[PDB]
Amino acid sequence: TKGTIYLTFDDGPINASIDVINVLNQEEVKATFYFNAWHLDGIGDENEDRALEALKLALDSGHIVANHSYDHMVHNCVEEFGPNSAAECNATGDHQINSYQDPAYDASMFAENLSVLEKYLPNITSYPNYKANEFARLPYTNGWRVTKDFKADGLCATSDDLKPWEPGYACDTANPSNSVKAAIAVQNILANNGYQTHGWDVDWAPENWGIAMPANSLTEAEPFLGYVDSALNTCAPTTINPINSKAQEFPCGTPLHADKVIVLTHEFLFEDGKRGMGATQNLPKLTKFIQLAKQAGYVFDTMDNYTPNWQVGNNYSAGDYVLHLGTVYQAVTSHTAQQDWAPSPTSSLWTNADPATNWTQNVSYKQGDVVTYQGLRYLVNVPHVSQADWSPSSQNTLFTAL
Ligand SMILES: [Ca+2]
Ligand SMILES: [Zn+2]
Numbered sequence: 001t002k003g004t005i006y007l008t009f010d011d012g013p014i015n016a017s018i019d020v021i022n023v024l025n026q027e028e029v030k031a032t033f034y035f036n037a038w039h040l041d042g043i044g045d046e047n048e049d050r051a052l053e054a055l056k057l058a059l060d061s062g063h064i065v066a067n068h069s070y071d072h073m074v075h076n077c078v079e080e081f082g083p084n085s086a087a088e089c090n091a092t093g094d095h096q097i098n099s100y101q102d103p104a105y106d107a108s109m110f111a112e113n114l115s116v117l118e119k120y121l122p123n124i125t126s127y128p129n130y131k132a133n134e135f136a137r138l139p140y141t142n143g144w145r146v147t148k149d150f151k152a153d154g155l156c157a158t159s160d161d162l163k164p165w166e167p168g169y170a171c172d173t174a175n176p177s178n179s180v181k182a183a184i185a186v187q188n189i190l191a192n193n194g195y196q197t198h199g200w201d202v203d204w205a206p207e208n209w210g211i212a213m214p215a216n217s218l219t220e221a222e223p224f225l226g227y228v229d230s231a232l233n234t235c236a237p238t239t240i241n242p243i244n245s246k247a248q249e250f251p252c253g254t255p256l257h258a259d260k261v262i263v264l265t266h267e268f269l270f271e272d273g274k275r276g277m278g279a280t281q282n283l284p285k286l287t288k289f290i291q292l293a294k295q296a297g298y299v300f301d302t303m304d305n306y307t308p309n310w311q312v313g314n315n316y317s318a319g320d321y322v323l324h325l326g327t328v329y330q331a332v333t334s335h336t337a338q339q340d341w342a343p344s345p346t347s348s349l350w351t352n353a354d355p356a357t358n359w360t361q362n363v364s365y366k367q368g369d370v371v372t373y374q375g376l377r378y379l380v381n382v383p384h385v386s387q388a389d390w391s392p393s394s395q396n397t398l399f400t401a402l
Pocket of ligand 2: 010011068072139140
């Protein structure tokens, strides 16, 4: 195959999600939906009376449901959050301004998301494709927490003052905005609580946000496949436009990113309504893009498989990454997986390579790594694989207390 495409849809569930899902099912592909549950509450300022129907359809159809936070951080767009905040933020267009403020409260919106999803769909945890407690994507931000050595931040994603297109706008990646730093803190909180976060390589969006009906200008299937072609193995998160969509320190050539393209788009771009004739004009583009991509040799997959799940009988090379029960592991040696020898906190064949920064058992630590343990920070003096009796302490010379 040519490569793997991960179609990811942000900001549902809304009425428009249903026709998108129907096209996906027509074309026999699965996608990943990064949902904001405030649409279930009817306060997200979209056509969303069928939001619960949409959520159920996504899950019953086998699509992955992942975590985009309860309210898309819109509580940070207004003075006091309420049923009208979505409309208010849409009126000012200030979504990307002061988007992240208090990292604790902002990170709690991912937990809130889980509570509201489970409120509206009480048996949601019985779907294997419900993954919202393990996979997240931050509003506005091409941020990544995938493995211990695969992390990146959107250093111009959000602003303290001006939007990227406004006069006087400047981004200093060496001295980023307070909003950007708060988002980084949110990423780190989520990682320490077991989340992976993923950004995107290409964003399927209007070619012209300036016309009357912007959605109509969504890239045609044929040239959008060209964009995907151009992104395959070219470190797209560092070169993507606009500037607020960049992940400047993305680790180009990192092994898990090879031969893969993550597409970001939004089901609201596939709706006949306030943004244009999205359903009539753009659902056919979605259909033909999927068909063209398959015929060009791509396959479609979902974000639960971006890091491949550990599988009995698979051959692994030293250095390979897998997921096992939500945790990333890296292969210590080349071997063939057997059912009774799975990755674990004590496995000789695997070390934990989660993107967390709390001290963790069975991690291959490097000199200079910083860990947190019992509320204290420590710096690793020498590379080693952590084990239970080598936890940080003031007497453990593997570490220096900071
Ligand atoms: Ca995890
Ligand atoms: Zn979003």
